[PDB]
Design a protein that fits this description.
Largest sheet of chain A: none
PDB class: transferase/transferase inhibitor
Bound molecules: the ligand Cc1ccc(-c2cc3c(N[C@@H](Cc4cccc(F)c4)P(=O)(O)O)ncnc3s2)cc1
Shape of chain A: globular
Order of helices and strands of chain A: HHHHHHHHHHHHHH
CATH superfamily of chain A: Farnesyl Diphosphate Synthase
Chains A, B: Farnesyl pyrophosphate synthase
CATH class of chain A: Mainly Alpha
Entry title: Crystal structure of human FPPS in complex with an allosteric inhibitor CL-08-038
Number of helices of chain A: 14
Oligomer: homodimer
Keywords: Transferase, Transferase-Transferase Inhibitor complex
Strand content of chain A: under 5%
Assembly: dimeric
CATH architecture of chain A: Orthogonal Bundle
Chain lengths: 341, 341
Amino acid sequence: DVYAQEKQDFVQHFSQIVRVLTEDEMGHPEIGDAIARLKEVLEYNAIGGKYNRGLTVVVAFRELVEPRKQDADSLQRAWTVGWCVELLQAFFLVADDIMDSSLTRRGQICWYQKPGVGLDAINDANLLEACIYRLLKLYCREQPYYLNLIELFLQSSYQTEIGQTLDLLTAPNVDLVRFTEKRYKSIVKYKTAFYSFYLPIAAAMYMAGIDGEKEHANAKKILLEMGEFFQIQDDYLDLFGDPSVTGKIGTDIQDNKCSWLVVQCLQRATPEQYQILKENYGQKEAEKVARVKALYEELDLPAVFLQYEEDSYSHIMALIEQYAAPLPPAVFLGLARKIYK
Amino acid sequence: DVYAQEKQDFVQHFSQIVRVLTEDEMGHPEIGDAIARLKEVLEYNAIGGKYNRGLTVVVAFRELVEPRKQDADSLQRAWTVGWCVELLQAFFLVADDIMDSSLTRRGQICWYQKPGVGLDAINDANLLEACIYRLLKLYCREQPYYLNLIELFLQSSYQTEIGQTLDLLTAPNVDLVRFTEKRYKSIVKYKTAFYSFYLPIAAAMYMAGIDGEKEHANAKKILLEMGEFFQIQDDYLDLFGDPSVTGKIGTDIQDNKCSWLVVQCLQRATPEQYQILKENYGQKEAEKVARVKALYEELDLPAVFLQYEEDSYSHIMALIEQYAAPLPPAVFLGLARKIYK
Ligand SMILES: Cc1ccc(-c2cc3c(N[C@@H](Cc4cccc(F)c4)P(=O)(O)O)ncnc3s2)cc1
Ligand SMILES: Cc1ccc(-c2cc3c(N[C@@H](Cc4cccc(F)c4)P(=O)(O)O)ncnc3s2)cc1
Ligand SMILES: Cc1ccc(-c2cc3c(N[C@@H](Cc4cccc(F)c4)P(=O)(O)O)ncnc3s2)cc1
Ligand SMILES: Cc1ccc(-c2cc3c(N[C@@H](Cc4cccc(F)c4)P(=O)(O)O)ncnc3s2)cc1
Ligand SMILES: Cc1ccc(-c2cc3c(N[C@@H](Cc4cccc(F)c4)P(=O)(O)O)ncnc3s2)cc1
Ligand SMILES: Cc1ccc(-c2cc3c(N[C@@H](Cc4cccc(F)c4)P(=O)(O)O)ncnc3s2)cc1
């Protein structure tokens, strides 16, 4: 609800985001061609998602800030910083698709896969990253929270990258002894939860003057837990989701991923059952993948998940009770609804 | 002289740079493996060069700052920021080697070429980039010039990237109608001169309290010119250098580069001579490359270069006369000597 209410004004803002990033000056003729490429990059990779992360910036700013202080310009800064989050995401995905050898993304040929692009997408990804800071300069350099947001984004980049390293180390080689629960939790926190859940809320907080380290730590405690659950639910749905509801068809098992499902399987399986999996984890051949699906069902994992989901909701609600103050608990509850839904 | 004097203390500092970046905390066990990878990355890619760029930070800080204010801690910040420059460079090179399909770098297998690495070097390059900001936080967060340096590095990244885009657009396809002088100048300024020449001096300036926009613009005017010359001399030596003196064996013509030599050739060549080049520009076959070398000699380019070199030195000395003030002209002269040498 509160997110379909913001979405038109947020997607309309993108046009302006591109105008000012691609604003080719009459004293810098000869980069035009390069700026033309930049626009193409932005248009292909920053659009076509659901925009949940960037929208969360905008929704949180509306719950955090006295409506008396939500002038046009403040709102516009909120949309801009929400766009910065989407650009951070776009930088990571263009680059991860290259690394994974992915084919599609958001049902569209991955950018690096287009003819004429290739490994040049490395630089394109780096430009997406840079755009973040250009935007924060342009829209926010005079604000008191400016440096807070630069450091936020930079930290968020570092965490995600470091998470990405751990993910890469963890799946070089089928060696399933690498796929510990500890290790799974740690990949999720670094690689996806900091930027997906902490970052957008933290950004809004800084924009609203809330810059305390305890405040931030309390929000972080709640949000990293949410982020763990979201990814767990994602791993689950990769296999048992309906592609109609999810809009993703899942290949986790072919891609020998450190998925929550694989992790639970290995905590639970007799030495015999280790072996069936050790066999079918990764082959393309569909009867390979189908025989892990059926093992997952035979280990009652869909129910393990359902117990984990209830457990998780109870914990989140306790975290919110304890650590939301002095933020409105709605900030968190609105997110919880978006992902326990 | 002034640079062999700083070099021992600057290369010794690297060890500490790695200690603090790889300082794995007793409350963050499970990223250790990832941090181990990070150390490997730093050790392989940030070492083995001549360190001119980072050293220039340190030399300039010593000429800019009253010796009364060159305490241990200030010096250490200077070495650190000089290392940040080397890390920016390392990020660009690991990533450019992947993009170009390069084989070696500093006579060492390119990092992405090592078995076990590959396209994972994309993320490794991104970690090199992040290290810059981790270091500036650690060593400089309390300094008044902190935000100045963050913005400096970020801008320097953006310029180099945007230059890299233009370079890529310019050589997709042998189309030599793309290789205008205007275009060559513009690739050099963005892609190499801002970060190679402006950045290190600008960093030292900010560290010394010199933060004025005119000051900075005056230093920029001098330094971008130096940077243009340096790259021109580099293009020249790629072909006519002695590999003994240079320590690089040059492949510019095989790699169909927008080299200064190619640009001059095309300004100068009859429609007939267009064709010989249009033929031999890019083949591996050595008699291809040799027949462009011989055309370059037949167009008197080695002398065109020598006239360009004298022209350039005269101009630099006028720029220094006009725009150095109130910096000590030695700051610039010390650099000029490093590259007109
Ligand atoms: C719909 C709607 C949205 C926001 C609010 C309020 C925000 C707010 C408020 N938020 C402030 C930021 C803030 C600080 C600490 C904790 C917060 F949750 C918010 P401001 O940036 O000054 O607007 N401070 C005091 N009263 C109110 S009432 C009231 C109604
Ligand atoms: C901060 C933040 C907030 C929301 C989200 C996402 C929500 C969501 C999403 N939400 C939908 C429900 C949902 C949630 C999780 C998985 C699903 F398949 C469906 P909706 O409740 O209709 O908006 N669907 C698919 N992908 C995503 S990513 C991601 C990060
Ligand atoms: C803040 C907040 C959080 C969660 C919810 C609800 C989720 C939900 C719900 N969610 C999920 C199922 C579910 C099962 C057990 C415990 C859950 F928390 C959720 P799904 O529909 O499968 O995505 N299913 C039926 N009713 C509700 S009400 C409503 C508000
Ligand atoms: C070997 C050696 C090196 C530096 C110097 C001096 C630097 C300096 C100086 N530099 C200052 C920074 C500065 C400001 C404007 C223009 C400059 F070139 C330097 P500080 O950061 O206060 O040290 N200001 C006034 N007198 C002096 S004498 C004197 C001898
Ligand atoms: C800011 C700054 C300062 C110096 C340099 C470089 C100097 C240099 C270099 N300098 C040497 C001489 C030289 C300069 C340019 C090209 C050469 F082949 C040799 P030296 O005078 O003995 O130190 N040699 C090879 N590569 C580089 S890069 C690059 C950037
Ligand atoms: C500040 C400053 C700048 C340049 C120099 C010198 C360069 C140079 C010199 N440099 C070069 C040649 C040269 C030729 C014409 C004009 C030049 F500026 C340099 P090289 O030896 O081929 O790298 N050759 C012989 N003597 C000198 S003195 C000394 C100090």
